[PDB]
Amino acid sequence: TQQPIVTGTSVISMKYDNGVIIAADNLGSYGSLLRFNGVERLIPVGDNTVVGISGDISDMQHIERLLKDLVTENAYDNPLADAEALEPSYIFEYLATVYQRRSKMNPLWNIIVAGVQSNGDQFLRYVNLLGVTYSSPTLATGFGAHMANPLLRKVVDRESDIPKTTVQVAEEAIVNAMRVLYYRDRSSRNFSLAIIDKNTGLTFKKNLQVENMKWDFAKDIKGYGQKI
Protein backbone atom coordinates (compact mmCIF):
# COMPACT_ATOMS: atom_id res chain seq x y z
CA THR A 1 0.00 0.00 0.00
CA GLN A 2 1.22 3.42 -0.95
CA GLN A 3 -0.14 6.87 -1.67
CA PRO A 4 0.24 8.82 -4.94
CA ILE A 5 2.65 11.75 -4.92
CA VAL A 6 3.07 13.40 -8.33
CA THR A 7 -0.14 12.92 -10.30
CA GLY A 8 -1.85 13.32 -13.63
CA THR A 9 -5.52 14.17 -13.97
CA SER A 10 -8.24 13.02 -16.41
CA VAL A 11 -7.83 11.02 -19.60
CA ILE A 12 -10.76 11.38 -21.98
CA SER A 13 -11.59 9.36 -25.08
CA MET A 14 -14.24 8.05 -27.44
CA LYS A 15 -14.52 6.08 -30.66
CA TYR A 16 -15.90 7.36 -33.98
CA ASP A 17 -16.66 5.63 -37.28
CA ASN A 18 -13.04 5.08 -38.39
CA GLY A 19 -11.04 4.97 -35.20
CA VAL A 20 -10.68 6.35 -31.70
CA ILE A 21 -9.52 9.59 -30.12
CA ILE A 22 -7.81 10.06 -26.79
CA ALA A 23 -6.51 13.12 -24.97
CA ALA A 24 -4.81 14.16 -21.72
CA ASP A 25 -3.39 17.42 -20.41
CA ASN A 26 0.31 17.76 -19.76
CA LEU A 27 0.28 18.44 -16.04
CA GLY A 28 2.05 16.70 -13.18
CA SER A 29 0.50 17.87 -9.92
CA TYR A 30 2.14 17.45 -6.53
CA GLY A 31 -0.65 17.85 -4.04
CA SER A 32 -2.18 21.23 -4.77
CA LEU A 33 1.04 22.48 -6.41
CA LEU A 34 0.91 22.35 -10.22
CA ARG A 35 4.60 21.36 -10.28
CA PHE A 36 5.32 19.91 -13.74
CA ASN A 37 4.05 21.14 -17.09
CA GLY A 38 5.84 19.10 -19.72
CA VAL A 39 4.30 15.76 -18.84
CA GLU A 40 3.21 13.57 -21.73
CA ARG A 41 0.61 11.16 -20.42
CA LEU A 42 -0.19 9.51 -23.73
CA ILE A 43 2.02 6.52 -24.49
CA PRO A 44 1.92 5.32 -28.09
CA VAL A 45 2.78 1.66 -28.57
CA GLY A 46 3.48 0.81 -32.18
CA ASP A 47 1.25 2.66 -34.60
CA ASN A 48 -2.16 1.19 -33.81
CA THR A 49 -2.27 1.85 -30.06
CA VAL A 50 -2.02 4.78 -27.64
CA VAL A 51 -2.14 4.36 -23.86
CA GLY A 52 -3.46 7.20 -21.71
CA ILE A 53 -2.38 7.11 -18.10
CA SER A 54 -3.60 9.10 -15.11
CA GLY A 55 -2.60 8.75 -11.49
CA ASP A 56 0.81 8.45 -9.91
CA ILE A 57 3.32 9.76 -12.44
CA SER A 58 6.15 7.63 -11.04
CA ASP A 59 4.04 4.52 -11.57
CA MET A 60 3.09 5.76 -15.02
CA GLN A 61 6.78 6.08 -15.95
CA HIS A 62 7.16 2.48 -14.78
CA ILE A 63 4.28 1.35 -16.99
CA GLU A 64 6.02 3.20 -19.82
CA ARG A 65 9.17 1.16 -19.45
CA LEU A 66 6.97 -1.92 -19.34
CA LEU A 67 5.48 -1.07 -22.72
CA LYS A 68 8.77 -0.26 -24.42
CA ASP A 69 9.89 -3.69 -23.29
CA LEU A 70 6.75 -5.37 -24.52
CA VAL A 71 7.71 -3.89 -27.90
CA THR A 72 11.35 -5.05 -27.77
CA GLU A 73 10.47 -8.53 -26.52
CA ASN A 74 7.80 -8.99 -29.20
CA ALA A 75 10.42 -8.30 -31.85
CA TYR A 76 12.57 -11.18 -30.59
CA ASP A 77 12.63 -14.18 -32.95
CA ASN A 78 9.57 -12.66 -34.58
CA PRO A 79 9.97 -12.10 -38.34
CA LEU A 80 6.38 -10.82 -38.50
CA ALA A 81 6.94 -8.15 -35.81
CA ASP A 82 5.82 -5.46 -38.24
CA ALA A 83 3.11 -7.57 -39.82
CA GLU A 84 0.74 -10.31 -38.69
CA ALA A 85 2.93 -7.11 -34.31
CA LEU A 86 1.42 -5.85 -31.05
CA GLU A 87 -2.37 -5.45 -31.05
CA PRO A 88 -4.15 -2.99 -28.74
CA SER A 89 -6.06 -5.90 -27.17
CA TYR A 90 -2.73 -7.59 -26.39
CA ILE A 91 -1.26 -4.47 -24.80
CA PHE A 92 -4.39 -4.04 -22.73
CA GLU A 93 -4.91 -7.62 -21.56
CA TYR A 94 -1.29 -7.49 -20.43
CA LEU A 95 -1.56 -4.23 -18.46
CA ALA A 96 -4.89 -5.36 -16.97
CA THR A 97 -3.16 -8.57 -15.89
CA VAL A 98 -0.47 -6.51 -14.20
CA TYR A 99 -4.87 -6.87 -10.86
CA GLN A 100 -1.84 -8.88 -9.72
CA ARG A 101 -0.49 -5.74 -8.10
CA ARG A 102 -3.75 -4.88 -6.32
CA SER A 103 -3.98 -8.51 -5.30
CA LYS A 104 -0.59 -8.22 -3.67
CA MET A 105 -1.76 -5.10 -1.84
CA ASN A 106 0.84 -2.98 -3.65
CA PRO A 107 -1.09 -1.29 -6.50
CA LEU A 108 0.16 0.84 -9.39
CA TRP A 109 -1.89 3.95 -8.52
CA ASN A 110 -3.31 4.62 -11.99
CA ILE A 111 -5.53 3.59 -17.78
CA ILE A 112 -7.37 3.82 -21.10
CA VAL A 113 -5.97 1.79 -23.97
CA ALA A 114 -7.14 3.22 -27.27
CA GLY A 115 -6.41 1.82 -30.69
CA VAL A 116 -7.43 -0.06 -33.82
CA GLN A 117 -7.28 -3.82 -34.20
CA SER A 118 -5.65 -5.28 -37.34
CA ASN A 119 -9.09 -6.33 -38.57
CA GLY A 120 -10.07 -2.64 -38.55
CA ASP A 121 -12.12 -2.75 -35.31
CA GLN A 122 -11.79 0.07 -32.79
CA PHE A 123 -10.40 -0.76 -29.37
CA LEU A 124 -11.23 1.26 -26.27
CA ARG A 125 -11.03 -0.29 -22.79
CA TYR A 126 -10.33 0.91 -19.22
CA VAL A 127 -8.36 -0.55 -16.29
CA ASN A 128 -7.39 0.95 -12.93
CA LEU A 129 -5.42 0.22 -9.76
CA LEU A 130 -8.13 -2.17 -8.57
CA GLY A 131 -7.79 -4.20 -11.75
CA VAL A 132 -11.33 -3.33 -12.77
CA THR A 133 -11.96 -3.24 -16.52
CA TYR A 134 -14.74 -2.13 -18.84
CA SER A 135 -15.56 -0.72 -22.27
CA SER A 136 -17.90 1.98 -23.54
CA PRO A 137 -18.22 4.13 -26.70
CA THR A 138 -16.69 6.88 -24.51
CA LEU A 139 -14.31 6.49 -21.55
CA ALA A 140 -12.85 9.02 -19.15
CA THR A 141 -10.90 8.73 -15.90
CA GLY A 142 -11.24 10.73 -12.72
CA PHE A 143 -12.81 14.12 -13.32
CA GLY A 144 -13.53 13.43 -16.97
CA ALA A 145 -15.74 10.57 -15.85
CA HIS A 146 -17.95 13.19 -14.27
CA MET A 147 -17.83 15.97 -16.80
CA ALA A 148 -16.51 14.56 -20.08
CA ASN A 149 -18.54 11.40 -20.32
CA PRO A 150 -21.78 13.39 -20.09
CA LEU A 151 -20.76 15.52 -23.07
CA LEU A 152 -19.24 12.76 -25.20
CA ARG A 153 -22.25 10.52 -24.57
CA LYS A 154 -24.39 13.22 -26.20
CA VAL A 155 -22.56 12.42 -29.44
CA VAL A 156 -22.42 8.64 -29.07
CA ASP A 157 -25.11 7.54 -26.64
CA ARG A 158 -25.10 3.91 -27.80
CA GLU A 159 -23.18 1.66 -30.20
CA SER A 160 -25.24 2.46 -33.30
CA ASP A 161 -23.97 6.06 -33.13
CA ILE A 162 -20.35 5.09 -33.82
CA PRO A 163 -20.51 4.78 -37.63
CA LYS A 164 -22.59 7.95 -37.71
CA THR A 165 -19.78 9.90 -36.05
CA THR A 166 -17.07 11.65 -38.04
CA VAL A 167 -13.52 12.46 -36.92
CA GLN A 168 -14.31 16.18 -36.96
CA VAL A 169 -17.44 15.77 -34.88
CA ALA A 170 -15.54 13.53 -32.47
CA GLU A 171 -12.34 15.55 -32.16
CA GLU A 172 -14.54 18.57 -31.59
CA ALA A 173 -16.35 16.93 -28.68
CA ILE A 174 -13.00 15.93 -27.26
CA VAL A 175 -11.53 19.40 -27.57
CA ASN A 176 -14.63 20.96 -26.07
CA ALA A 177 -14.52 18.56 -23.13
CA MET A 178 -10.89 19.42 -22.49
CA ARG A 179 -11.97 23.05 -22.17
CA VAL A 180 -14.80 22.24 -19.76
CA LEU A 181 -12.38 20.27 -17.61
CA TYR A 182 -10.05 23.25 -17.59
CA TYR A 183 -12.94 25.37 -16.29
CA ARG A 184 -13.91 23.14 -13.37
CA ASP A 185 -11.00 20.77 -12.62
CA ARG A 186 -5.84 19.99 -11.11
CA SER A 187 -5.91 20.57 -14.87
CA SER A 188 -3.74 22.35 -17.40
CA ARG A 189 -4.57 24.40 -20.48
CA ASN A 190 -1.96 22.52 -22.49
CA PHE A 191 -2.72 18.99 -23.58
CA SER A 192 -2.05 16.27 -26.11
CA LEU A 193 -4.54 14.55 -28.38
CA ALA A 194 -4.21 11.41 -30.45
CA ILE A 195 -6.33 9.87 -33.17
CA ILE A 196 -5.91 6.31 -34.36
CA ASP A 197 -7.73 5.97 -37.66
CA LYS A 198 -8.03 2.66 -39.49
CA ASN A 199 -6.93 4.53 -42.62
CA THR A 200 -4.88 7.62 -41.75
CA GLY A 201 -3.12 5.58 -39.07
CA LEU A 202 -1.91 7.22 -35.86
CA THR A 203 -1.98 11.01 -35.65
CA PHE A 204 -0.39 12.32 -32.47
CA LYS A 205 -0.94 16.02 -31.78
CA LYS A 206 1.21 17.84 -29.23
CA ASN A 207 1.03 21.19 -27.44
CA LEU A 208 -2.64 21.84 -28.08
CA GLN A 209 -4.25 24.55 -25.96
CA VAL A 210 -7.70 25.36 -24.70
CA GLU A 211 -8.99 28.29 -26.75
CA ASN A 212 -12.28 30.16 -27.15
CA MET A 213 -13.01 30.58 -23.46
CA LYS A 214 -15.86 32.68 -22.10
CA TRP A 215 -14.62 34.74 -19.15
CA ASP A 216 -16.07 38.15 -19.99
CA PHE A 217 -19.34 37.77 -18.05
CA ALA A 218 -17.17 37.72 -14.90
CA LYS A 219 -16.97 41.53 -14.96
CA ASP A 220 -20.73 41.73 -14.33
CA ILE A 221 -20.43 39.72 -11.12
CA LYS A 222 -19.57 41.57 -7.94
CA GLY A 223 -20.11 40.69 -4.29
CA TYR A 224 -21.66 37.42 -3.13
CA GLY A 225 -25.26 38.50 -2.60
CA GLN A 226 -23.15 44.00 -2.70
CA LYS A 227 -23.88 46.18 -5.74
CA ILE A 228 -20.50 47.73 -6.60
Partner: protein
Amino acid sequence: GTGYDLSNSVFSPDGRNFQVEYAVKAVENGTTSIGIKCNDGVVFAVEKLITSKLLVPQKNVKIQVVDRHIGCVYSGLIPDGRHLVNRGREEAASFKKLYKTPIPIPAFADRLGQYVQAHTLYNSVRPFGVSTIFGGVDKNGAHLYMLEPSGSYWGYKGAATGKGRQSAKAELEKLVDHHPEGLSAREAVKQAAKIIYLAHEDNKEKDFELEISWCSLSETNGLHKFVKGDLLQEAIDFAQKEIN
Protein backbone atom coordinates in the same frame (compact mmCIF):
# COMPACT_ATOMS: atom_id res chain seq x y z
CA GLY B 1 48.39 -40.62 -17.08
CA THR B 2 45.25 -39.82 -19.12
CA GLY B 3 41.53 -39.15 -18.74
CA TYR B 4 42.13 -35.43 -18.41
CA ASP B 5 39.51 -35.04 -21.12
CA LEU B 6 36.53 -36.61 -19.39
CA SER B 7 35.67 -33.83 -16.91
CA ASN B 8 34.98 -30.23 -17.92
CA SER B 9 36.89 -28.12 -15.44
CA VAL B 10 40.04 -30.30 -15.39
CA PHE B 11 43.49 -29.03 -16.39
CA SER B 12 45.58 -31.37 -18.52
CA PRO B 13 49.34 -31.58 -17.79
CA ASP B 14 50.01 -28.95 -20.46
CA GLY B 15 47.46 -26.54 -18.99
CA ARG B 16 44.55 -27.08 -21.35
CA ASN B 17 40.87 -27.83 -20.88
CA PHE B 18 40.18 -30.63 -23.37
CA GLN B 19 36.43 -30.53 -22.93
CA VAL B 20 36.45 -26.95 -24.25
CA GLU B 21 38.56 -28.02 -27.19
CA TYR B 22 36.13 -30.82 -27.98
CA ALA B 23 33.39 -28.19 -27.94
CA VAL B 24 35.29 -26.35 -30.64
CA LYS B 25 35.13 -29.48 -32.78
CA ALA B 26 31.33 -29.32 -32.60
CA VAL B 27 31.63 -25.70 -33.78
CA GLU B 28 33.95 -26.35 -36.73
CA ASN B 29 31.55 -29.09 -37.78
CA GLY B 30 28.75 -26.58 -38.13
CA THR B 31 27.51 -24.24 -40.86
CA THR B 32 29.63 -21.24 -41.73
CA SER B 33 28.68 -17.70 -40.67
CA ILE B 34 30.39 -14.32 -40.68
CA GLY B 35 30.44 -10.71 -39.64
CA ILE B 36 31.74 -7.64 -41.48
CA LYS B 37 32.36 -4.35 -39.71
CA CYS B 38 31.84 -1.32 -41.94
CA ASN B 39 32.31 2.45 -41.53
CA ASP B 40 29.09 2.94 -39.52
CA GLY B 41 27.63 -0.46 -38.71
CA VAL B 42 27.98 -4.22 -39.10
CA VAL B 43 26.63 -6.97 -41.32
CA PHE B 44 25.83 -10.55 -40.39
CA ALA B 45 25.30 -13.43 -42.76
CA VAL B 46 25.02 -17.18 -42.41
CA GLU B 47 24.71 -20.34 -44.52
CA LYS B 48 21.48 -22.35 -44.20
CA LEU B 49 21.84 -25.89 -45.56
CA ILE B 50 18.71 -26.96 -47.44
CA THR B 51 18.47 -30.52 -46.12
CA SER B 52 15.37 -31.04 -48.25
CA LYS B 53 12.67 -29.45 -50.37
CA LEU B 54 10.39 -29.75 -47.35
CA LEU B 55 12.12 -26.88 -45.53
CA VAL B 56 9.74 -23.94 -45.89
CA PRO B 57 12.00 -21.33 -47.51
CA GLN B 58 12.92 -18.18 -45.57
CA LYS B 59 11.26 -19.57 -42.42
CA ASN B 60 13.81 -21.34 -40.22
CA VAL B 61 15.63 -18.11 -39.23
CA LYS B 62 18.99 -18.21 -37.49
CA ILE B 63 20.26 -14.68 -36.89
CA GLN B 64 18.95 -13.24 -33.65
CA VAL B 65 18.58 -9.79 -32.20
CA VAL B 66 19.33 -8.70 -28.65
CA ASP B 67 17.41 -5.65 -27.47
CA ARG B 68 17.06 -3.42 -30.52
CA HIS B 69 20.65 -2.78 -31.66
CA ILE B 70 22.49 -6.09 -31.24
CA GLY B 71 22.71 -8.79 -33.86
CA CYS B 72 23.89 -12.32 -33.12
CA VAL B 73 24.84 -15.21 -35.37
CA TYR B 74 26.54 -18.46 -34.44
CA SER B 75 28.01 -21.73 -35.72
CA GLY B 76 27.75 -25.06 -33.94
CA LEU B 77 25.02 -26.51 -31.74
CA ILE B 78 22.11 -24.19 -32.54
CA PRO B 79 20.20 -24.89 -29.34
CA ASP B 80 23.28 -23.79 -27.34
CA GLY B 81 23.33 -20.59 -29.38
CA ARG B 82 19.75 -19.72 -28.52
CA HIS B 83 20.50 -20.37 -24.85
CA LEU B 84 23.39 -17.89 -25.00
CA VAL B 85 21.13 -15.28 -26.64
CA ASN B 86 18.36 -15.73 -24.09
CA ARG B 87 20.95 -14.93 -21.46
CA GLY B 88 22.34 -12.01 -23.42
CA ARG B 89 18.79 -10.71 -23.79
CA GLU B 90 18.27 -10.72 -20.01
CA GLU B 91 21.77 -9.44 -19.53
CA ALA B 92 20.77 -6.51 -21.76
CA ALA B 93 17.37 -5.81 -20.16
CA SER B 94 19.00 -5.80 -16.73
CA PHE B 95 21.59 -3.28 -17.90
CA LYS B 96 19.05 -0.97 -19.51
CA LYS B 97 16.69 -1.15 -16.54
CA LEU B 98 19.34 0.17 -14.16
CA TYR B 99 21.26 2.55 -16.44
CA LYS B 100 18.45 3.60 -18.81
CA THR B 101 20.75 3.64 -21.83
CA PRO B 102 20.80 0.50 -24.03
CA ILE B 103 23.87 -1.69 -23.39
CA PRO B 104 27.16 -0.73 -25.14
CA ILE B 105 28.47 -3.43 -27.48
CA PRO B 106 31.74 -3.95 -25.54
CA ALA B 107 29.81 -4.16 -22.26
CA PHE B 108 27.50 -6.69 -23.88
CA ALA B 109 30.45 -8.69 -25.14
CA ASP B 110 31.86 -9.18 -21.66
CA ARG B 111 28.45 -10.21 -20.37
CA LEU B 112 28.38 -13.09 -22.83
CA GLY B 113 32.08 -13.47 -22.24
CA GLN B 114 31.86 -13.92 -18.48
CA TYR B 115 28.82 -16.20 -18.78
CA VAL B 116 30.50 -18.54 -21.27
CA GLN B 117 33.79 -18.56 -19.34
CA ALA B 118 31.64 -19.58 -16.38
CA HIS B 119 30.76 -22.86 -18.13
CA THR B 120 34.42 -23.94 -18.09
CA LEU B 121 34.83 -23.65 -14.31
CA TYR B 122 32.80 -26.64 -13.09
CA ASN B 123 32.46 -30.28 -14.18
CA SER B 124 28.72 -30.13 -13.64
CA VAL B 125 28.17 -28.16 -16.82
CA ARG B 126 29.14 -28.58 -20.44
CA PRO B 127 30.93 -25.82 -22.35
CA PHE B 128 29.04 -24.02 -25.12
CA GLY B 129 29.01 -25.78 -28.46
CA VAL B 130 29.04 -22.56 -30.48
CA SER B 131 31.24 -19.70 -31.59
CA THR B 132 29.25 -16.49 -31.84
CA ILE B 133 29.60 -13.41 -33.98
CA PHE B 134 27.63 -10.43 -32.74
CA GLY B 135 27.77 -6.65 -32.73
CA GLY B 136 25.95 -3.40 -33.29
CA VAL B 137 26.13 0.38 -33.09
CA ASP B 138 26.36 2.36 -29.88
CA LYS B 139 27.20 5.71 -28.27
CA ASN B 140 30.53 5.58 -30.08
CA GLY B 141 30.73 3.55 -33.24
CA ALA B 142 30.07 0.07 -34.47
CA HIS B 143 31.62 -3.02 -32.92
CA LEU B 144 32.08 -6.57 -34.21
CA TYR B 145 32.82 -9.48 -31.89
CA MET B 146 33.40 -13.21 -31.95
CA LEU B 147 33.19 -15.43 -28.89
CA GLU B 148 34.81 -18.86 -28.48
CA PRO B 149 33.51 -21.76 -26.32
CA SER B 150 36.46 -20.92 -24.06
CA GLY B 151 34.72 -17.63 -23.37
CA SER B 152 37.52 -15.84 -25.23
CA TYR B 153 36.48 -12.99 -27.52
CA TRP B 154 37.99 -9.99 -29.32
CA GLY B 155 36.99 -7.06 -31.49
CA TYR B 156 37.11 -7.70 -35.22
CA LYS B 157 37.13 -5.91 -38.56
CA GLY B 158 35.82 -9.10 -40.07
CA ALA B 159 35.11 -12.47 -38.52
CA ALA B 160 33.99 -15.92 -39.51
CA THR B 161 33.48 -19.36 -38.06
CA GLY B 162 32.09 -22.74 -39.08
CA LYS B 163 32.84 -25.17 -41.91
CA GLY B 164 34.36 -22.58 -44.26
CA ARG B 165 35.93 -20.19 -41.79
CA GLN B 166 39.17 -20.32 -43.83
CA SER B 167 37.65 -19.44 -47.20
CA ALA B 168 35.82 -16.65 -45.43
CA LYS B 169 38.80 -15.41 -43.42
CA ALA B 170 40.78 -15.50 -46.65
CA GLU B 171 38.21 -13.27 -48.35
CA LEU B 172 37.85 -11.04 -45.31
CA GLU B 173 41.59 -10.44 -45.21
CA LYS B 174 41.48 -9.31 -48.84
CA LEU B 175 38.75 -6.80 -48.04
CA VAL B 176 40.66 -5.43 -45.07
CA ASP B 177 43.65 -4.74 -47.34
CA HIS B 178 41.73 -3.46 -50.37
CA HIS B 179 39.70 -1.02 -48.26
CA PRO B 180 41.91 0.80 -45.71
CA GLU B 181 39.40 3.67 -45.78
CA GLY B 182 36.42 1.55 -44.73
CA LEU B 183 33.68 -0.43 -46.45
CA SER B 184 30.07 0.81 -46.59
CA ALA B 185 26.91 -0.76 -45.22
CA ARG B 186 25.52 -1.21 -48.74
CA GLU B 187 28.86 -2.62 -49.91
CA ALA B 188 29.35 -5.02 -46.98
CA VAL B 189 25.88 -6.48 -47.49
CA LYS B 190 26.86 -7.72 -50.97
CA GLN B 191 30.43 -8.57 -50.03
CA ALA B 192 28.99 -10.71 -47.26
CA ALA B 193 26.61 -12.53 -49.62
CA LYS B 194 29.64 -13.32 -51.76
CA ILE B 195 31.83 -14.62 -48.94
CA ILE B 196 29.04 -16.93 -47.86
CA TYR B 197 28.78 -18.21 -51.43
CA LEU B 198 32.52 -18.79 -51.69
CA ALA B 199 32.81 -20.36 -48.25
CA HIS B 200 29.93 -22.63 -49.28
CA GLU B 201 32.33 -24.68 -51.41
CA ASP B 202 33.49 -26.62 -48.34
CA ASN B 203 29.95 -28.00 -48.31
CA LYS B 204 29.10 -27.59 -52.01
CA GLU B 205 27.31 -30.95 -51.81
CA LYS B 206 24.09 -29.58 -50.28
CA ASP B 207 22.12 -26.57 -51.51
CA PHE B 208 21.84 -23.64 -49.11
CA GLU B 209 19.80 -20.55 -48.31
CA LEU B 210 21.34 -17.13 -47.68
CA GLU B 211 20.51 -14.93 -44.69
CA ILE B 212 21.84 -11.47 -43.96
CA SER B 213 21.13 -8.75 -41.41
CA TRP B 214 22.71 -5.43 -40.61
CA CYS B 215 22.98 -2.52 -38.25
CA SER B 216 24.10 0.79 -39.79
CA LEU B 217 23.93 4.19 -38.17
CA SER B 218 22.70 5.56 -41.49
CA GLU B 219 21.06 2.68 -43.34
CA THR B 220 19.02 1.40 -40.35
CA ASN B 221 19.32 4.25 -37.87
CA GLY B 222 21.49 2.13 -35.61
CA LEU B 223 18.87 -0.60 -35.31
CA HIS B 224 19.34 -4.24 -36.21
CA LYS B 225 17.23 -5.23 -39.21
CA PHE B 226 17.15 -8.21 -41.57
CA VAL B 227 17.99 -7.81 -45.24
CA LYS B 228 14.89 -8.73 -47.24
CA GLY B 229 13.39 -8.63 -50.73
CA ASP B 230 15.11 -6.43 -53.29
CA LEU B 231 18.25 -5.57 -51.31
CA LEU B 232 18.62 -9.28 -50.58
CA GLN B 233 18.24 -10.33 -54.22
CA GLU B 234 20.60 -7.59 -55.31
CA ALA B 235 23.24 -9.06 -52.99
CA ILE B 236 22.39 -12.67 -53.90
CA ASP B 237 23.07 -11.78 -57.52
CA PHE B 238 26.24 -9.82 -56.80
CA ALA B 239 27.53 -13.14 -55.46
CA GLN B 240 25.95 -15.44 -58.05
CA LYS B 241 27.80 -13.30 -60.58
CA GLU B 242 31.29 -13.45 -59.07
CA ILE B 243 30.95 -17.12 -58.22
CA ASN B 244 31.58 -17.51 -61.96
